[PDB]
Amino acid sequence: TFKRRNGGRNKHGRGHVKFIRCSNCGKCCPKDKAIKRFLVRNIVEQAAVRDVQEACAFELYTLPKLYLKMQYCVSCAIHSKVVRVRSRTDRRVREPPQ
Amino acid sequence: VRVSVLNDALKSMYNAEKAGKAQVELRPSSKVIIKFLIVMQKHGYIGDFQYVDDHRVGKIVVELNGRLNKCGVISPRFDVGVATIEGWTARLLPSRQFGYIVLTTSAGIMDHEEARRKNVGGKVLGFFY
Amino acid sequence: GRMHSRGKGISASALPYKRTPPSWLKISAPDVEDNICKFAKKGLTPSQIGVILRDSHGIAQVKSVTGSKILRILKAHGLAPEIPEDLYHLIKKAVAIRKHLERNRKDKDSKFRLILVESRIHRLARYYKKTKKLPPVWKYESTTASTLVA
Amino acid sequence: MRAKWKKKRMRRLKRKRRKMRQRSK
Amino acid sequence: GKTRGMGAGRKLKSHRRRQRWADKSYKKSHLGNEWKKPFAGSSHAKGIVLEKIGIEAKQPNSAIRKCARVQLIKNGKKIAAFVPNDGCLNYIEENDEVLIAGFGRKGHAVGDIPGVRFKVVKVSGVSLLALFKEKKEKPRS
RNA sequence: GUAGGAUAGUGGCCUACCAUGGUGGUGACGGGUGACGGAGAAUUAGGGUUCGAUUCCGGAGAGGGAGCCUGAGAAACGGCUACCACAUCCAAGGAAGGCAGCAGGCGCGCAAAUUACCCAAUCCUGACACGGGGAGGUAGUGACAAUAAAUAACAAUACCGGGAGUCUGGUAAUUGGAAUGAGUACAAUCUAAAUCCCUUAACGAGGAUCCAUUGGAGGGCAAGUCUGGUGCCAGCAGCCGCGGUAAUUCCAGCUCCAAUAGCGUAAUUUAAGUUGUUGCAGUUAAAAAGCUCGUAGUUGGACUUUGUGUUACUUUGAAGAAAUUAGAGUGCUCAAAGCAAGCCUACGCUCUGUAUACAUUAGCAUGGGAUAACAUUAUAGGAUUUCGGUCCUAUGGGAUCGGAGUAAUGAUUAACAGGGACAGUCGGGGGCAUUCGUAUUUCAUAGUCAGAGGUGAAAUUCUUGGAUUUAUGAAAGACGAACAACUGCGAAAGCAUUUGCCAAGGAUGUUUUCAUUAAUCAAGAACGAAAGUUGGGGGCUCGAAGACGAUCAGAUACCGUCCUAGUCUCAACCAUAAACGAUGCCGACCAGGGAUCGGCGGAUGUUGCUAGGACUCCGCCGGCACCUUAUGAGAAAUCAAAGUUUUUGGGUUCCGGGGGGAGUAUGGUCGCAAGGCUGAAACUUAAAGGAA
Ligand SMILES: [K+]
Ligand SMILES: [K+]
Ligand SMILES: [K+]
Ligand SMILES: [K+]
Ligand SMILES: [K+]
Ligand SMILES: [K+]
Ligand SMILES: [K+]
Ligand SMILES: [K+]
Ligand SMILES: [K+]
Ligand SMILES: [K+]
Ligand SMILES: [K+]
Ligand SMILES: [Mg+2]
Ligand SMILES: [Mg+2]
Ligand SMILES: [Mg+2]
Ligand SMILES: [Mg+2]
Ligand SMILES: [Mg+2]
Ligand SMILES: [Mg+2]
Ligand SMILES: [Mg+2]
Ligand SMILES: [Mg+2]
Ligand SMILES: [Mg+2]
Ligand SMILES: [Mg+2]
Ligand SMILES: [Mg+2]
Ligand SMILES: [Mg+2]
Ligand SMILES: [Mg+2]
Ligand SMILES: [Mg+2]
Ligand SMILES: [Mg+2]
Ligand SMILES: [Mg+2]
Ligand SMILES: [Mg+2]
Ligand SMILES: [Mg+2]
Ligand SMILES: [Mg+2]
Ligand SMILES: [Mg+2]
Ligand SMILES: [Mg+2]
Ligand SMILES: [Mg+2]
Ligand SMILES: [Mg+2]
Ligand SMILES: [Mg+2]
Ligand SMILES: [Mg+2]
Ligand SMILES: [Mg+2]
Ligand SMILES: [Mg+2]
Ligand SMILES: [Mg+2]
Ligand SMILES: [Mg+2]
Ligand SMILES: [Mg+2]
Ligand SMILES: [Mg+2]
Ligand SMILES: [Mg+2]
Ligand SMILES: [Mg+2]
Ligand SMILES: [Mg+2]
Ligand SMILES: [Mg+2]
Ligand SMILES: [Mg+2]
Ligand SMILES: [Mg+2]
Ligand SMILES: [Mg+2]
Ligand SMILES: [Mg+2]
Ligand SMILES: [Mg+2]
Ligand SMILES: [Mg+2]
Ligand SMILES: [Mg+2]
Ligand SMILES: [Mg+2]
Ligand SMILES: [Zn+2]
């Protein structure tokens, strides 16, 4: 039984795609199959912004942000709850959630 | 590549008829296609068809009237003597009362009923009913 | 589609329904054939003779003015090349690939394309021998091909 | 048994025959 | 798909010739291995009873099927022949002439009897059916 | 091939001499056949599958070979000679042998009859009207096979139904008279003589013992949830199953069912559209070659008259053994059959009948010329008259070389086939050289001081000889992040830092050119991830094997630490992957929709820009895809192709036929090896498998 029209990856009109290494376990996974999430958050957690802002040595200073691109294998994405098992009808929804 | 222009012409008409179209274009044209249409026209299975000259091979637009159930070629074009016409009709036609097998004989392209009257054999082109 | 690929392009010329020359074309058939012979003696081929006539003389189709194709006109004046133009260009391409391939032994892509070009040469040469446009014993030889063309 | 390992088992078995037959030639 | 050309008579005929071998029924008759069977293409065969044996019935049944090892007189091959009906093994003695037949599935095993494809029809020139129904008696004693 | 020899005669049939040919993927050569060929036989909607030792025809043989005489005819065997193999008689010195003729015997086997009578029929043969004929016929044996057809009919009672009543129908080893051949037998007939049949005097039926059998009764599959016995035993059961103490299935009785003088059991046809030409399959059930090229093969656009080039095809006809098959005629009592008969009543008749069709393919001959194949075409060696020259030859003809005419003088078109040229492009396509990037590791310098590492927790391990950590710098080798996508290029494998060089390519554009040059492909070729092999270079990282630390009942594992081959490169091999879209290629047609990549056409007004670029809108061609939908398809999942399929046929290649055994054994071939390619059988099994 064929579960997905895309076969679980995103590859059309090409033979080979070089793999990436899972950010969690290091497993090799084709880049077009890996679950990718681009996390942008303040380098200082919200629980410490007040303290760090009070101790600032500059009248004005914008706290930088932390940019991290996370690439998971399927096993880690499911285990870490980055993605969840969806019903047969909901599997086709490709739009990101709210 | 294009092997049988007759098959393309008859397949196009059959698909158009099932979709309920009134007209259909056949390209390329040939004198075999035109003579096959005339046999269908004489028995009231198609309406008026028109040949367009394009200086290369021509095109045909055929008016459909909803009476054509199916029309197809027989490939390869087997030899059919007069005595073997009965077996072919028992194979290709819905019944012993309507439907025509088109033959190419030395006397010209004609349906199997005319071939029996003239007692001439030939080769199968196609059929319709 | 293409003989030696998966291409399915259809781009091509579309000849007009009017086979006669336009009313604004005043050049006569003897004048046109004089130019065709004049260009052939300069080394031009039938393909690039018609391009000049279309682009610089307003002659869309030579057959409409003269009633004969360019190659037929050249043959009537003994100017048709011994090797047909299209076969000549395939040999020239095969020579170019082989010359490139002698310095690039690891260019396996070129080695693949050389096979396709030479097989195209042999299919066209076979046809020309059947129609007697080439000598009956004519044969394509990689060793001596470069002497024929260029 | 996994087909890959059954294939591996047969190849080992063929080497011994190949060696158990060339021993006497 | 199929080759259709009017001049493709040779290819169609030769293709079918090769593909008929893929059919098990066709290959069983045209291989020639039937002559190597104990009957060697015969319907029946006479033999000598070597010993009276019992075979454990195959699961899920549970019984002792009474058979007899027989050596065929015409080629000297040894086979196991099932002895049908109740108490018919008592009518068979060792070193006795028995007519053997197939078991009904053309060389295949039948029922729950493991690896048995023959049955005993006659013993000492008398049918087991006649002895079972007390129609006749074995010629001795 | 030439000349001979031999033969009834042709011929390497044989000899001498000469030449180097002959056959072959359109399968030669060789091998297998439990292979004599055909007419035919079985089964068959059609197509087909299987069989064909045997009475007709042809061939071949007489235990195995060889040789030969006689003769018109024999390489004869109920003729001879020899050898070999068997075997008979003998007074042992010799002699005689050929049943695959008829009968008979032995042997072999699952498997097959009398050592009978006769030339009367059919016909054959001799000197012959007459003899002879185990050819042939007759009888015996004969459940090979085939045909017809008994084993009861009727009435009245008793009993039981249907349309109180009474008509009709059904049961009984009840009661009655009738019928009749199986049998038996005077006779006649039959026959060569007998025998059987047919005919017929007498005799011949009541439980009409003048006694019907063979297989079944759970399902398939017609017929019992009866009774007794047995208790997973014995047994049954083709398959599914039954039997373990209440057996519809075993062993019995009863009853019932099927066929019935027959029925049961143990190669082949049907069923099988499970061999598929008609007519099957290959996304997931068994099955698309990893990819492309490529010869043979197979298949190939349109166009020429409508209103002595060669073939296929079609029409008609001729020729074609009978028997069999189909079929006309005919009351053997019917029938299977047979080829007879019929008509009237005379010295006979219907000339009595003994038709006709079918009969592949190849060959022969007429008519037709659509469709299709091959061949052919432009320095016409062209057609066509006419006028000469020359040569050869008859009672003019032929050959050859010329002149001058006549004529519309003589070339289909340019495929939304293909090839080639050209134009501006486009691309992470390929090769060579070259630029750069952080990181990692190592090393150097400097700083600092107790841990650092790693894990679920730990330990192996490193560390005051300064580890880990921080800064700077150097070296090495690998890798090429982010950008990066339901995007691009490539035949596939695969391809991602810059710039240059080299050849190649798709698409688009084109009033350029050639003019069918094409599609798909046995054989044969090029390329083909990773791992692996050989040698050289390199050797950061990671890391099979190995070692160690943990975990654990054990842990040769998973987790941790160290590390060999390897990982990178060059030269040379290997040729395999879930090499996947698990979907071969070319062509046509058949819904809608937006987005996107390349090229081009049109429209339009903005840019911290140099007509153009960037963007916006409309459209065309080509490409990777996606979304909705069924009027489609499908076992469904699902698919805009996997659609246009029992309303079945566009072209072509590969490939499957229940599950295993098994991609195994063996042989061949390739490879240094690892292995690759090719590839069984015995045997085993009633399921395995797909989708939901
Ligand atoms: K994914
Ligand atoms: K183009
Ligand atoms: K077939
Ligand atoms: K001769
Ligand atoms: K000779
Ligand atoms: K004589
Ligand atoms: K006689
Ligand atoms: K006589
Ligand atoms: K059918
Ligand atoms: K290779
Ligand atoms: K598009
Ligand atoms: Mg699953
Ligand atoms: Mg592509
Ligand atoms: Mg791949
Ligand atoms: Mg196309
Ligand atoms: Mg091709
Ligand atoms: Mg098809
Ligand atoms: Mg001679
Ligand atoms: Mg000689
Ligand atoms: Mg035979
Ligand atoms: Mg034989
Ligand atoms: Mg025979
Ligand atoms: Mg025999
Ligand atoms: Mg016989
Ligand atoms: Mg004979
Ligand atoms: Mg003889
Ligand atoms: Mg003998
Ligand atoms: Mg002899
Ligand atoms: Mg004899
Ligand atoms: Mg004789
Ligand atoms: Mg018998
Ligand atoms: Mg009786
Ligand atoms: Mg019973
Ligand atoms: Mg029933
Ligand atoms: Mg009981
Ligand atoms: Mg039963
Ligand atoms: Mg089958
Ligand atoms: Mg099937
Ligand atoms: Mg599977
Ligand atoms: Mg499969
Ligand atoms: Mg054509
Ligand atoms: Mg074109
Ligand atoms: Mg791109
Ligand atoms: Mg980069
Ligand atoms: Mg091949
Ligand atoms: Mg490789
Ligand atoms: Mg493979
Ligand atoms: Mg595959
Ligand atoms: Mg292919
Ligand atoms: Mg493929
Ligand atoms: Mg665009
Ligand atoms: Mg859909
Ligand atoms: Mg079909
Ligand atoms: Mg199988
Ligand atoms: Zn992971």
| CA pair distance A50, A64, nearest whole angstrom | 15
Cross-strand pairs, A28? A21
| CA pair distance C89, C95, nearest whole angstrom | 10
Bridging pattern class, strands E118-123 and E78-82: parallel
Cα–Cα distances (Å) from C117 to A20, A66, C4, C96, E87, in that order, read 40, 57, 9, 11, 86
Owner of token pair 């035109």: B34
Residues B52 and B14 in one domain: yes
* Domain limits for position B88: 69-129
Owner of token pair 């046109």: C32
| CA pair distance C34, C65, nearest whole angstrom | 13
**How crowded is residue B12: how many other Cβ atoms within 10 Å of its Cβ?**
16
Residue C21 falls inside a structural domain: no
Q: Are B51 and B62 in contact (CB under 8 A)?
A: no
The total domain count for chain B is 2
> Where are any strands of DSSP class E within E75-137?
78-82, 97-102, 118-123, 126-127
Q: Are E90 and E137 in contact (CB under 8 A)?
A: no
| CA pair distance B123, C104, nearest whole angstrom | 59
| CA pair distance B70, B44, nearest whole angstrom | 14
Q: Residue E35, by phi and psi: left (phi above 0), alpha (psi -120 to 50) or beta?
A: alpha
Residues B92 and B43 in one domain: no
| CA pair distance C105, C98, nearest whole angstrom | 10
| CA pair distance B88, B112, nearest whole angstrom | 10
Which of B39, B68, B97 lies at the terminal end of a domain, its last residue?
Answer: B68
| Three-state helix/strand/coil letters over E41-76 | CCCEEEEEEEEEEEEECCCCCCCEEEEEEEEECCCC
Residue C75 falls inside a structural domain: yes
Q: Residue E77, by phi and psi: left (phi above 0), alpha (psi -120 to 50) or beta?
A: beta
Report angle CA C113, C115, C117 to the nearest 5 degrees.
70
* Approach to solving: cryo-EM
Cα end-to-end span (Å), chain E: 74
Bridging pattern class, strands B108-111 and B100-105: antiparallel
Query: Residue A31 phi/psi, 5° resolution?
Result: -60, -35
The total domain count for chain C is 2
Peptide bond just before B76 cis, omega within 30 deg: yes
Q: Which nucleotides of F are covered by protein (CB under 7 A)?
A: 26, 32-34, 46, 108-111, 215, 232-239, 241-244, 250-251, 265-268, 274-278, 280, 282-284, 288, 292-295, 297-304, 313-316, 367-372, 378, 411, 413-422, 428-432, 480, 482-496, 502-519, 526-529, 570-572, 581-582, 584-591, 621-628, 631, 637-639, 642-645, 647-658, 662-666, 674-675, 681-686, 690-692
| CA pair distance E96, E138, nearest whole angstrom | 11
Peptide bond just before E84 cis, omega within 30 deg: no
- The four Cα atoms E25, E27, E31, E37 give a dihedral, to 10 degrees, of -30
Chain C within 8 Å of B54 (Cβ-Cβ)?
Answer: yes
Residues C90 and C148 in one domain: yes
* Domain limits for position C31: 26-80
Q: Are A32 and A9 in contact (CB under 8 A)?
A: yes
